Design an enzyme around this catalytic site. Structure first.
Site, mmCIF file in Angstrom:
data_model
loop_
_atom_site.group_PDB
_atom_site.id
_atom_site.type_symbol
_atom_site.label_atom_id
_atom_site.label_comp_id
_atom_site.label_asym_id
_atom_site.label_seq_id
_atom_site.Cartn_x
_atom_site.Cartn_y
_atom_site.Cartn_z
ATOM 1 N N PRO A 1 0.812 -1.207 0.000
ATOM 2 C CA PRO A 1 0.000 0.000 0.000
ATOM 3 C C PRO A 1 0.850 1.264 0.000
ATOM 4 O O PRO A 1 1.790 1.409 0.792
ATOM 5 C CB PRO A 1 -0.806 -0.123 1.305
ATOM 6 C CG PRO A 1 0.065 -1.014 2.190
ATOM 7 C CD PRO A 1 0.636 -2.017 1.227
ATOM 8 N N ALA B 1 -3.609 2.703 2.074
ATOM 9 C CA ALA B 1 -4.403 2.893 3.303
ATOM 10 C C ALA B 1 -5.724 3.588 2.984
ATOM 11 O O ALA B 1 -5.729 4.762 2.624
ATOM 12 C CB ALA B 1 -3.602 3.684 4.342
ATOM 13 N N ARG C 1 -0.905 -5.751 8.565
ATOM 14 C CA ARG C 1 0.399 -5.133 8.698
ATOM 15 C C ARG C 1 0.563 -4.724 10.149
ATOM 16 O O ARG C 1 -0.349 -4.136 10.738
ATOM 17 C CB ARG C 1 0.546 -3.950 7.718
ATOM 18 C CG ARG C 1 2.009 -3.558 7.528
ATOM 19 C CD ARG C 1 2.211 -2.540 6.412
ATOM 20 N NE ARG C 1 3.556 -2.703 5.881
ATOM 21 C CZ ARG C 1 4.061 -2.034 4.845
ATOM 22 N NH1 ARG C 1 3.388 -1.019 4.307
ATOM 23 N NH2 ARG C 1 5.257 -2.360 4.357
ATOM 24 N N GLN D 1 -5.652 -2.243 1.727
ATOM 25 C CA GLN D 1 -5.349 -2.031 3.130
ATOM 26 C C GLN D 1 -6.412 -1.114 3.723
ATOM 27 O O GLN D 1 -6.574 0.014 3.263
ATOM 28 C CB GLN D 1 -3.949 -1.411 3.276
ATOM 29 C CG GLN D 1 -3.543 -1.262 4.726
ATOM 30 C CD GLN D 1 -2.289 -0.435 4.886
ATOM 31 O OE1 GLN D 1 -2.264 0.755 4.522
ATOM 32 N NE2 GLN D 1 -1.249 -1.034 5.481
ATOM 33 N N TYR E 1 -0.486 4.193 13.772
ATOM 34 C CA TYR E 1 -1.893 4.522 13.584
ATOM 35 C C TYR E 1 -2.716 3.819 14.659
ATOM 36 O O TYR E 1 -2.167 3.382 15.676
ATOM 37 C CB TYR E 1 -2.324 4.193 12.143
ATOM 38 C CG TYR E 1 -1.520 4.948 11.093
ATOM 39 C CD1 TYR E 1 -1.390 6.324 11.135
ATOM 40 C CD2 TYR E 1 -0.877 4.284 10.077
ATOM 41 C CE1 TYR E 1 -0.675 7.031 10.156
ATOM 42 C CE2 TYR E 1 -0.129 4.978 9.100
ATOM 43 C CZ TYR E 1 -0.022 6.328 9.148
ATOM 44 O OH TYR E 1 0.710 6.993 8.192
ATOM 45 N N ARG F 1 8.685 2.110 -3.467
ATOM 46 C CA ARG F 1 9.165 3.283 -4.212
ATOM 47 C C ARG F 1 9.675 2.964 -5.619
ATOM 48 O O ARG F 1 9.501 3.758 -6.569
ATOM 49 C CB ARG F 1 10.198 4.042 -3.397
ATOM 50 C CG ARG F 1 9.535 4.844 -2.293
ATOM 51 C CD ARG F 1 10.530 5.374 -1.310
ATOM 52 N NE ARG F 1 11.134 4.283 -0.556
ATOM 53 C CZ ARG F 1 12.006 4.490 0.397
ATOM 54 N NH1 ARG F 1 12.348 5.738 0.714
ATOM 55 N NH2 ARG F 1 12.528 3.447 1.021
#
Ligand SMILES: Cc1cc2nc3c(=O)[nH]c(=O)nc-3n(C[C@H](O)[C@H](O)[C@H](O)COP(=O)(O)O)c2cc1C
Ligand SMILES: Cc1cc2nc3c(=O)[nH]c(=O)nc-3n(C[C@H](O)[C@H](O)[C@H](O)COP(=O)(O)O)c2cc1C
Ligand SMILES: O=c1ccc2ccccc2o1
Ligand SMILES: O=c1ccc2ccccc2o1
Ligand SMILES: O=c1ccc2ccccc2o1
Ligand SMILES: O=c1ccc2ccccc2o1
Ligand SMILES: O=c1ccc2ccccc2o1
Ligand SMILES: O=c1ccc2ccccc2o1
Lengths: 359, 359
Positions: free
Chosen positions: A22, A56, A230, A98, A182, A325
């Site tokens: 994600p 996300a 995750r 996700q 989070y 990336r």
């Protein structure tokens, strides 16, 4: 090559071991995705990766990280994903998503618009919620509101509704976002969770929100589709051995509660840490979790060098290699990797209108 | 860097000198483009090139190369391009389109489905048309039907309607496909044109279809948007000096008739040739046309090595560098080129949700 062997989990078969993890795009409007996401995701899927996990996606408006975050907190939000899911499947990749709640790190600016908590008098912002009224600090100084028991029940139900929506939009893989400081991660960590009720204190109590959310999601998520999470298994905060031991124990509980694979990450729960960044630095920690919890794993950070990905798989450190990336730089990274690792007819990693010409 | 300097032609400004030349995808159905093309083109536009020229798009059904070719022979065909054009503009690239008629090379299989003329009893195929009833040969043995004067008027009008449609769909750049052995190229070449009327024999007569088509298109194409053509200026058939001289004379006539830029190519009119393939091999021929016709030019073949592109621009061989296959391999080639040539903040060749993370 190990990287190009298929992988089967439950009823889903990935054509290779390359996962696109994600990656938040910060391009949604009031949670609704748009043609930014459609083209981004379909283009990635055509690049050859076996699994594409959508960014996300907030289970509730206040669970967005930023005003640009995707959401799935209504059926109309879920509908916007249907054509994207269908495009990912048309390309032969497996569509995952996700689902997330940013907790105390919510109500932040986009990363290229300051990356910090939004000012109180900015009309875009909102009150954040968390296990305890304690700020992250640094560029995220906002003190969140301590959740009530009814808030906990409501957020759990939002995860359930989000998973049900994901299912009905056609996703074949779900990932619960219990990492990166989070909401879920912050319930587990003693740094952020000072609660004195059933959801804080002891290991069982700190685990409780995460286990209950997984169990509630499991009721609506098909048993034949991978159920994943995750999770940050250490913080690099000087408490790593104790934190890893508890994290691995929770991973054992996740497995016993039907988790099919764990995406192993760093917690990012607090800012005062010393993370030893480097190519494939997570490999040894992912391998320990895999071994000690007897659970399949993926991880990420620096696997865009195809040989690192191959080595991690061959060493049985990972079951899938997540490559982030490098896919923003080159959506066709899987083709690059196929060439690097000597795959026969490497260009046929791509669809015919590309492959034919690149032999 | 020369490659990253903007370019203005008529009222259109390209953000750099990288052009993505037309590249047939063979993914359309009865000429209608679909989400293959949408995602392909929008993804390319986001990669950073200044100009994106849509693939050979047939002005009439029988002018398709293959059953997978895009078409613009009705308003409903043109409508399908509108969202793609809007997505290319959203990405900051200039949307162009090549309008085409395959002539004697029409009614062929897709390149990965045999690449040869379709069998006579295959329900997908059709009668081809050309200046003269002479086959290309080799893998394209079908003898075309010799066009009548009314066929010539009709095809010219199909080019006009195609250009009008392109205009109204929002394209900002048009390219007439007079290259690669297709209809226009085949009217110019004495190899394929044995006509004894006003459209064959002399240089003026062989030029006539091309000049009349350009002039007719010019009536509906806005004077403030670039009007271009692709044209094969030699064949590598042992007649190169004479053929180049005539081709350059026709380029002078195109310029005098309002052509803004010429995409300089090889004719591919017949198979029995000896083309000296190599990196940037067209540079010297493109430069000669540029100089002797006093017209801006682009060309292609092997400019995916960023230094070759830069050198061609600095030497004033080309005004734009067309980069084809490298963009099928990596849709973000312009970012790669920016890094190679030392562009400051190279990652901002890409949009923010990529650029921010790749610094
Ligand atoms: C643009 C961007 C957005 C990210 N968004 C998320 C996200 O939505 N969820 C998450 O769990 N990780 C997110 N991450 C972390 C990535 O999934 C991944 O772990 C990280 O980029 C390391 O892998 P890499 O070195 O291959 O990039 C994001 C990373 C980037 C670069
Ligand atoms: C997949 C593919 C399709 C092509 N389709 C066309 C086309 O529609 N029109 C045209 O004029 N040339 C077409 N070409 C030629 C390309 O525009 C370009 O001249 C050629 O690929 C050489 O540049 P390169 O070495 O950068 O690939 C095509 C080439 C490829 C590879
Ligand atoms: O979970 C997340 C969400 C966004 C993000 C952006 C950059 C790096 C890591 C990230 O992790
Ligand atoms: O990989 C692929 C192959 C074919 C295809 C067709 C339409 C849309 C997407 C596609 O992706
Ligand atoms: O292929 C790439 C290119 C750039 C880059 C930058 C940061 C991290 C990973 C990267 O991968
Ligand atoms: O004009 C064209 C059209 C298609 C094509 C395909 C491969 C190479 C060259 C081509 O030229
Ligand atoms: O380069 C870009 C930048 C923004 C954007 C937004 C929506 C669609 C396409 C886009 O492309
Ligand atoms: O970047 C690339 C990669 C492959 C390739 C193959 C043929 C021609 C050009 C190419 O460019």
């Amino acid at each position: 090559s190990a990287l190009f062997e298929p992988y089967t989990l439950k009823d889903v078969t990935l054509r290779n071991r390359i996962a696109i993890p994600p990656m938040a795009q910060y391009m949604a409007e009031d949670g609704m995705i748009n043609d930014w996401h459609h083209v981004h995701l379909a283009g990635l899927a055509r690049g050859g990766a076996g699994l594409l996990v959508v960014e996300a996606t907030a289970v509730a408006p206040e669970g967005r990280i930023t005003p640009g975050c995707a959401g799935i907190w209504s059926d109309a939000h879920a509908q916007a994903f249907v054509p994207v899911v269908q495009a990912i499947k048309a390309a032969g990749s497996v569509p995952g998503i996700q689902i997330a709640h940013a907790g105390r790190k919510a109500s932040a600016n986009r990363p290229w618009e300051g990356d910090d908590h939004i000012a109180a008098d900015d009309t875009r912002g909102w009150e954040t919620i968390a296990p305890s009224a304690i700020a992250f600090g640094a560029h995220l100084p906002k003190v969140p509101r301590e959740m009530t028991l009814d808030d906990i029940a409501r957020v759990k139900q939002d995860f359930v509704d989000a998973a049900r929506r994901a299912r009905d939009a056609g996703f074949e893989w779900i990932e619960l976002h219990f990492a990166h400081g989070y909401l879920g991660q912050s319930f587990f960590s003693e740094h952020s969770n000072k609660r004195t009720d059933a959801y804080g204190g002891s290991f069982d109590n700190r685990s409780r929100f995460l286990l209950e959310t997984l169990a509630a999601v499991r009721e609506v998520w098909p048993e034949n589709l991978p159920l994943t999470a995750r999770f940050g298994v250490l913080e690099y905060d000087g408490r790593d051995e104790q934190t890893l031991e508890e994290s691995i124990e929770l991973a054992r509980r996740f497995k016993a509660g039907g988790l099919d694979l764990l995406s192993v990450s760093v917690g990012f729960t607090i800012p005062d840490t010393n993370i030893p960044w480097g190519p494939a630095f997570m490999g040894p920690i992912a391998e320990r979790v895999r071994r000690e919890a007897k659970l399949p794993v993926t991880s990420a950070w620096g696997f865009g060098t195809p040989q690192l990905a191959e080595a991690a798989l061959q060493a049985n450190q990972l079951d899938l290699v997540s490559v982030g990336r490098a896919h923003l730089a080159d959506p066709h990274w899987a083709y690059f990797a196929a060439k690097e690792l000597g795959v026969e007819k490497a260009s046929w990693t791509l669809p015919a209108p590309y492959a034919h010409w690149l032999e």
